[PDB]
Design a protein around this ligand. Sequence first.
Ligand SMILES: *[C@@H]1O[C@H](CO[C@H]2O[C@@H](C)[C@@H](O)[C@@H](O)[C@@H]2O)[C@@H](O[C@@H]2O[C@H](CO)[C@@H](O)[C@H](O)[C@H]2NC(C)=O)[C@H](O)[C@H]1NC(C)=O
Ligand SMILES: *[C@@H]1O[C@@H](C)[C@@H](O)[C@@H](O[C@@H]2O[C@H](CO)[C@@H](O)[C@H](O)[C@H]2O)[C@@H]1O
Ligand SMILES: *[C@@H]1O[C@@H](C)[C@@H](O)[C@@H](O[C@@H]2O[C@H](CO)[C@@H](O)[C@H](O)[C@H]2O)[C@@H]1O
Ligand SMILES: *[C@@H]1O[C@@H](C)[C@@H](O)[C@@H](O[C@@H]2O[C@H](CO)[C@@H](O)[C@H](O)[C@H]2O)[C@@H]1O
Ligand SMILES: *[C@H]1O[C@H](CO)[C@@H](O)[C@H](O)[C@@H]1O
Ligand SMILES: *[C@H]1O[C@H](CO)[C@@H](O)[C@H](O)[C@@H]1O
Ligand SMILES: *[C@H]1O[C@H](CO)[C@@H](O)[C@H](O)[C@@H]1O
Ligand SMILES: *[C@H]1O[C@H](CO)[C@@H](O)[C@H](O)[C@@H]1O
Ligand SMILES: *[C@H]1O[C@H](CO)[C@@H](O)[C@H](O)[C@@H]1O
Ligand SMILES: *[C@H]1O[C@H](CO)[C@@H](O)[C@H](O)[C@@H]1O
Ligand SMILES: *[C@H]1O[C@H](CO)[C@@H](O)[C@H](O)[C@@H]1O
Ligand SMILES: *[C@H]1O[C@H](CO)[C@@H](O)[C@H](O)[C@@H]1O
Ligand SMILES: *[C@H]1O[C@H](CO)[C@@H](O)[C@H](O)[C@@H]1O
Ligand SMILES: *[C@H]1O[C@H](CO)[C@@H](O)[C@H](O)[C@@H]1O
Ligand SMILES: *[C@H]1O[C@H](CO)[C@@H](O)[C@H](O)[C@@H]1O
Ligand SMILES: *[C@H]1O[C@H](CO)[C@@H](O)[C@H](O)[C@@H]1O
Lengths: 165, 220
Amino acid sequence: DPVLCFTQYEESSGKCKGLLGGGVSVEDCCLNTAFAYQKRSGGLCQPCRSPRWSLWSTWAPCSVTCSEGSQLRYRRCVGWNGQCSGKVAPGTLEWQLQACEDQQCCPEMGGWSGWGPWEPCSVTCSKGTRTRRRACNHPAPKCGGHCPGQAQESEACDTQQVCPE
Amino acid sequence: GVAGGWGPWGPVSPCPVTCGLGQTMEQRTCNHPVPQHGGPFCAGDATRTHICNTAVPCPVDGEWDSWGEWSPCIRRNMKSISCQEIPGQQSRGRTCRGRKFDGHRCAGQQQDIRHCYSIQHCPLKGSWSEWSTWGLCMPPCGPNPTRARQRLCTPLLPKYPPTVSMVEGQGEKNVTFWGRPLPRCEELQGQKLVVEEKRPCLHVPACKDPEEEELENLYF
Ligand SMILES: *[C@@H]1O[C@H](CO[C@H]2O[C@@H](C)[C@@H](O)[C@@H](O)[C@@H]2O)[C@@H](O[C@@H]2O[C@H](CO)[C@@H](O)[C@H](O)[C@H]2NC(C)=O)[C@H](O)[C@H]1NC(C)=O
Ligand SMILES: *[C@@H]1O[C@@H](C)[C@@H](O)[C@@H](O[C@@H]2O[C@H](CO)[C@@H](O)[C@H](O)[C@H]2O)[C@@H]1O
Ligand SMILES: *[C@@H]1O[C@@H](C)[C@@H](O)[C@@H](O[C@@H]2O[C@H](CO)[C@@H](O)[C@H](O)[C@H]2O)[C@@H]1O
Ligand SMILES: *[C@@H]1O[C@@H](C)[C@@H](O)[C@@H](O[C@@H]2O[C@H](CO)[C@@H](O)[C@H](O)[C@H]2O)[C@@H]1O
Ligand SMILES: *[C@H]1O[C@H](CO)[C@@H](O)[C@H](O)[C@@H]1O
Ligand SMILES: *[C@H]1O[C@H](CO)[C@@H](O)[C@H](O)[C@@H]1O
Ligand SMILES: *[C@H]1O[C@H](CO)[C@@H](O)[C@H](O)[C@@H]1O
Ligand SMILES: *[C@H]1O[C@H](CO)[C@@H](O)[C@H](O)[C@@H]1O
Ligand SMILES: *[C@H]1O[C@H](CO)[C@@H](O)[C@H](O)[C@@H]1O
Ligand SMILES: *[C@H]1O[C@H](CO)[C@@H](O)[C@H](O)[C@@H]1O
Ligand SMILES: *[C@H]1O[C@H](CO)[C@@H](O)[C@H](O)[C@@H]1O
Ligand SMILES: *[C@H]1O[C@H](CO)[C@@H](O)[C@H](O)[C@@H]1O
Ligand SMILES: *[C@H]1O[C@H](CO)[C@@H](O)[C@H](O)[C@@H]1O
Ligand SMILES: *[C@H]1O[C@H](CO)[C@@H](O)[C@H](O)[C@@H]1O
Ligand SMILES: *[C@H]1O[C@H](CO)[C@@H](O)[C@H](O)[C@@H]1O
Ligand SMILES: *[C@H]1O[C@H](CO)[C@@H](O)[C@H](O)[C@@H]1O
């Protein structure tokens, strides 16, 4: 079965670099153990050396940003015609799951308090703005929480007074 | 406007590699009908490549295997030397795995030997160590992974000379302990050897292909 043959294998990247050609069987391409092959070009680049386990990748991000989570890292057996340690076929993946913690607390949103009384109208003649503010401390937020909505309603008011001409 | 044309192909380069696959190429020039005034130009390519196949494999050098297990600690002409001040010698072996096709042989010593004291199955006084670091989540990609840390009965090694002169070898060689002793310790939570506690791991992520997982999060 033909396969694309590459002249160099870049470790820690899992990529075939330096294309030589296709239409050549896997046996001929892997006569030099420093080569690598990729079938159908979709992926699955594999070195020609004896199968040996690759390196543990960096930890995947913690499954949740809150309290205790779980994160994974993979390791693939790379090689041709052979088995890794443990009677494992080339292309198989091993995993290690680990508990992680980004931060201790997590945002518990607070509740709105009683409304502050209506502030006086922003102007003494014609029409103005009537502001109404409250606070977000019933209860108070922790970590990174915030109250839903806004903390200052604003309406209009008519003073029913004419300005001097 | 004078049409460009190709000349003769140059000599093909010899197969540069002495093993496996290589590559050859030929070099021709557009010097036979040279294009004039820039009207037309010679078409095609000025360099064709071919793959030269040599059936001989390539020398793959031998890489050392991981160390085997330490041999039992024995003294010559004394049979068992357990739980006694008797210096033995234990060996450890490697395997030059992978040397093929005139590859360079493995460099070093395939046999490691150290002087030892035997402590196999000896009853000793013990003491409970502190809580170990929380282990991994196991089984990964399995039903309900569970972490686990453990306190255990740490044996108290007998105060024997760690530095002994060997009469046969005329050397002052170090001695280390080897074996599985049977430690004695007051019961802690109803266990005489190792008491552990398990906690389930939270928000377990599914195990998918590193490429497939990458394409899945990107696509949402
Ligand atoms: C045990 O001894 C080593 C060195 O001596 C011996 O090593 C044995 C494995 C064996 O092969 C034997 O034939 C050989 O003589 C000590 O290593 C030394 O440690 C000190 C401090 O740790 C360093 O400063 C030295 O550089 C280092 N090497 C030498 C050559 O002295 C080792 O520490 C010792 N272990 C104990 C627990 O005492
Ligand atoms: C990661 O970062 C944290 C700061 C949070 O914003 C996380 O979002 C979620 O927030 C709610 C609180 O409303 C918690 O119940 C969730 O546990 C948490 O996932 C975010 O994922
Ligand atoms: C309150 O009383 C009213 C009767 C006005 O006298 C106001 O002053 C007027 O305010 C507008 C803008 O606020 C200005 O254009 C006028 O110049 C000023 O007379 C007062 O604030
Ligand atoms: C020619 O003879 C062979 C028997 C090998 O000894 C060859 O060595 C190999 O040369 C190629 C490059 O030409 C390298 O890819 C290999 O790493 C090397 O083993 C020698 O050239
Ligand atoms: C991952 O695990 C250890 C290091 O943590 C080594 O055996 C090796 O680097 C592997 O890739
Ligand atoms: C996870 O573990 C450590 C950092 O916590 C490093 O080895 C690396 O960043 C890995 O992703
Ligand atoms: C304040 O605003 C409304 C109630 O007025 C709710 O979204 C919630 O109780 C918030 O604390
Ligand atoms: C203030 O506004 C109304 C009452 O006017 C209610 O949503 C609530 O009592 C709030 O504190
Ligand atoms: C403003 O509006 C009325 C009085 O106009 C009352 O509900 C309260 O004083 C509020 O602050
Ligand atoms: C040179 O190359 C090929 C013939 O080898 C043609 O495309 C054409 O004759 C060009 O001049
Ligand atoms: C080079 O290649 C072939 C001979 O192999 C011919 O088409 C022609 O001689 C060209 O110059
Ligand atoms: C055996 O000795 C150590 C590990 O104990 C390493 O140098 C290496 O793994 C070797 O095979
Ligand atoms: C010999 O020494 C210890 C066991 O006592 C381990 O490091 C290992 O099994 C080695 O082969
Ligand atoms: C076992 O180990 C020591 C005594 O040997 C103490 O830490 C405790 O009694 C524990 O049960
Ligand atoms: C384990 O538990 C706590 C720390 O988690 C301490 O009492 C001590 O380190 C024990 O070994
Ligand atoms: C496991 O849990 C935390 C770290 O996640 C620490 O208390 C300690 O390292 C323990 O072994």
